Amino acid sequence: GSSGSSGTGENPYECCECGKVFSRKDQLVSHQKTHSGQSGPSSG
Ligand SMILES: [Zn+2]
């Protein structure tokens, strides 16, 4: 059976950073928060 068994299932919220899917964006946001991205000690 060769049908690309990479990524069983598809969802609108799939953290590419590590590779974790969620149910509601909300839950994802809290996850992506601790992931690569523009966030640090700014000046203001
Ligand atoms: Zn992640």
- In the chain, the domains with their CATH numbers are 11-44 (3.30.160.60)
**How far apart are the CA of 9 and the centre of ligand 1, in A?**
17
Method: NMR
What is the dihedral angle through the alpha carbons of 19, 21, 26, 29, rounded to the nearest 10 degrees? 0
Whole-angstrom Cα distance, residue 38 to residue 26? 19
**How far apart are the CA of 33 and the centre of ligand 1, in A?**
9
What is the dihedral angle through the alpha carbons of 1, 9, 20, 25, rounded to the nearest 10 degrees? 170
Whole-angstrom Cα distance, residue 21 to residue 3? 21
Give the closest residue to 12 by CA, choosing from 2, 1, 3, 21: 21
**How far apart are the CA of 24 and the centre of ligand 1, in A?**
14
**How far apart are the CA of 28 and the centre of ligand 1, in A?**
8
**How far apart are the CA of 44 and the centre of ligand 1, in A?**
28
